[model samples]
Target: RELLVERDGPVVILTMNRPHRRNALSTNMVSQFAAAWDEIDHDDGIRAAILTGAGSAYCVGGPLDPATIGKGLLLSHTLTKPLIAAVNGACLGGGCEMLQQTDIRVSDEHATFGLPEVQRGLVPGAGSMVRLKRQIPYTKAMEMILTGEPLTAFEAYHFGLVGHVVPAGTALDKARSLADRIVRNGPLAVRNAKEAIVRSGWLAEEDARAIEARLTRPVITSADAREGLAAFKEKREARFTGR
Candidate 1:
């Protein structure tokens, strides 16, 4: 398999396991990615996920992988649980687009990012064109798209593409820590909050408000919500069971 998957508590760790190909998306890997995420979505025990790659390079991007032209690679943008990307190295082109879809991103200081499709007489046909500019400054995304150049991890972070930058080998650890914090929250709250955050970007303000209320209604009226309030009153930690 081109991918390695593991479960720890409420989190799933997905490692791109094709170091020899820099974990470039293989057809098999693409299949695995889709299957893994679908299962993650269906599993009540899963609260979040951390994505990373094996070896020195994350991925150089792969035109051979249909995901590049598909609805979206990994179906990341639609996953109910939050996805965190721990980018270690050589995140470029299609891979860059893939990472951007994640809810949170932690990158190794030595990692690099770019959309160099133009250099190859191609385009960042993935989500880069639409998603990149939306994520950061329009002009900066244009520069990367037009020039086909890479950005250092610091620069990428400065532009808001990354949430945290860690030492070369610490990205995965940082992502795991972040995942733990997330899973500790009320599971329904965490999932609804993520859904609200993503939906807010596209919906009109009024529509977004209604959607937020709708999503929050169930959680706020659930046993976990009652437990949270009771814990506050009792001055103790709240125990949430995703109910």
Candidate 2:
């Protein structure tokens, strides 16, 4: 199972299966991984996803055959759907960059994160160079990038690198629990909301607000929105059909 794929209701769980090499992504594994996300993008049933590595490691980086690997194996940065990272242990190098693509993250107490490329006399080409500063304070992100040292789970959480820190071996459980909550929301709204949030990172504040309105217009006029309003009026939960 070099790339294991599973589905739990609306969630797609992907396991990077290679503990022997600390779940490093082989070139072939990256190819397979790209297909998985492509499927998720097209499949209406998949509302969100959880990515974690097998065994005691999440991922060290990519194998040498093809060196330009990304945080989500392929072009995960382009994925519009939401993603969650369930980090267990030794999340260094490319592993840390992988989290940059995730909307939410849960890490184990023993899990560690770093971008050690500079220590190797190299620059970070993964998603981290741009994403780290966006995700955390500019000064702290610069320190982490220049030092090339690992951050403990506590530091990662306090810096907002990860959303939650759980006991060792419980990271995936916690992530799935959170995904469960997102899964219950109106699927159309979820996609529109994430698109707006991700786009807002680079868009000007006024432009972002305009983009949000343009993107949400259809959803607000759809049957799902009407159902939500009816549910609120009747004091009941809404059942959205992705309309």
Candidate 3:
């Protein structure tokens, strides 16, 4: 299988399994990713997700059909639950592009990130061209985009691209730790918060504020909100049912 889906309670881990090719994206792998994400989004039992590679190399990135890559790369998806990246090795080109879509990223000390498409006389159009500059500083983003050089895991952390850097082969462990924390929170609130933050990025200030208000109202009025406040008053842990 090109993609392996493993369920750990509320967290689902998606592993890119073609490490022989450095987990380079293939048509089959792309289809698997699209299907896996479809199930992850629709299944209420899933509260969080982690994306990682199976072996030494995360993904070196490769050619993919532009017409269909959007669904496969999550470029056209608006995910409700938080997605984390466990960057275990080389995260270049399309791998780095998908990394941008993740809410949080944990990279192993040996991990390398870059967009090498320009070096190959191509562009990292999956999401890199659009999201990269918005994520890191203009000069840094430009440097990566223009040079097509990889960044060390520590450098990625310094640039605020990845949230945490861990020992070699431990990115998944740290990702699961973070996922555990996320799943313990009110599911509805978490989803809405992520939605507001991601969606507001393209909106005008007034429109963004209005949409934030709209997204927040439901969470504030939810049963989970009531339970959370009550738990605080009672000095107990909140039992959120995602209401």
- Best candidate according to TM-score: 3
Tens-place lDDT per residue, model 2, 136-208, is 9888789888999888999999999999999989999998998888888888998988887777667778988
Tens-digit lDDT track of model 1 for 1-243: 787889998999999998988988767777777778778889999999999999998778773445433523743337889999999888987678788778999999999999889999999866688788889999999999999999999999999989899987999999999999998889999988888887777778899899888888999789999999999999998999988
Ten-residue region with minimum lDDT total, candidate 2: 63-72
Model 3: ten consecutive residues of lowest lDDT: 62-71
lDDT of 3 by residue, 1-243 (tens): 899999999999999999899999888888888888889889988999999998899888865566456777889976678999999999998889988999999999999999989899998888788888899887889999999998999999999999999998899999999999999899999999999998889778999999899999999999999999999999998989999
RMSD, every candidate, angstroms? 2.3, 2.4, 1.6
- Scored against the true structure, residue 81 in model 3 reaches a CA lDDT of 82
Looking at model 2, the pairs that clash are none
Each model's TM-score, in the order given?
0.93, 0.92, 0.96
Q: What lDDT does candidate 3 reach at residue 58?
A: 87
Superior by lDDT: candidate 2 or candidate 3: 3
Error of 2 at 40 (Å): 0.5
Model 2 local distance difference test score: 0.83
Q: What is the lDDT of residue 20 in candidate 2?
A: 93
